[PDB]
């Protein structure tokens, strides 16, 4: 949260390596004397974000959604693709051609992406995500003043 301007800023940090790979057979921290590139970006989220979690799968072939709780009680899931560090400022040819959206620091809370339609949690202490067995199913249980699954 920023004191200068009354707002909540959203910073996403990502680690990226170069074009050439290392041994890539056995990983160890004794070796690998390199410094990975760090990417940072900023967004605006008009909420408090009491709780926060990521959907975790067994194999990890589906998308990576971020579950965020609100003081209201509704839990909203948003895709990691929107909050990506590789967001060019000016629209360039190849970036728009492959898969990208122009960068804009405005995130709106859509009512359609509301898991909690009627059932709300008064106090969102935390949420637990458990990977199921099929491929693309995660069991989300929100605990606190009430229990909801």
């Amino acid at each position: 949260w920023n004191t200068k301007a009354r707002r909540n800023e959203f910073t996403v940090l990502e680690l990226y390596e170069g074009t050439e790979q290392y041994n890539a057979t056995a990983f160890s921290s004794l070796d690998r004397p390199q410094l990975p590139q760090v990417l940072q970006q900023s967004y605006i989220f008009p909420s408090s974000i009491s709780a926060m979690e990521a959907t975790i799968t067994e194999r990890g072939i589906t998308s990576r959604h971020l579950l965020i709780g609100l003081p209201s009680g509704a839990i909203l899931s948003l895709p990691k693709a929107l909050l990506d560090p590789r967001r060019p400022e000016i629209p360039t040819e190849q970036s728009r051609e492959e898969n990208l959206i122009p960068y804009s620091p405005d995130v709106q809370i859509h009512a359609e992406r509301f898991i909690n339609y009627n059932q709300t949690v008064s106090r969102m202490r935390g949420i637990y995500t458990a990977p199921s067995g099929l491929e693309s199913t995660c069991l989300v249980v929100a605990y606190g003043l009430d229990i909801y699954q």
């Binding site: 605006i44 009491s50 620091p105």
Partner: protein
């Protein structure tokens, strides 16, 4: 110093007492919480200086948050909620009157 904020919300129809059930208002979100009256009014006390966004929370008909700026001298200035811009858009009177449009769309249509 401490100040108090008053407000009054009106539903399109039905009954004020029916909508009063399970209805609260947030000033910051977890810091200051206000409760509604029998027909409708939120009155909040024990508030320090600063600017806060008042929003009425309800699983039923929702409301538009309103930004309120509080001065030490005692001037109250209400404006629309603006994040990209940080200027004065349009000025409205202090007697907060929120007008709920209706039920928010929770389910998609196929």
């Amino acid at each position: 110093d401490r100040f108090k904020i008053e407000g009054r919300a009106v539903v399109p129809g039905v009954k004020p007492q029916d909508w009063i059930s399970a209805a609260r208002v947030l000033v910051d979100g977890e810091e200051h919480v206000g409760f509604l009256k029998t027909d409708g009014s939120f009155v909040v006390h024990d508030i320090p200086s600063g600017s806060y966004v008042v929003e009425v929370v309800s699983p039923a008909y929702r409301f538009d948050p309103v930004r309120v700026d509080i001065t030490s001298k005692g001037k109250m200035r209400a404006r629309y909620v603006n994040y990209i811009k940080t200027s004065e858009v349009v000025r409205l009177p202090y007697p907060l009157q929120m007008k709920s449009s209706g039920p928010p769309s929770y389910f998609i249509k196929r």
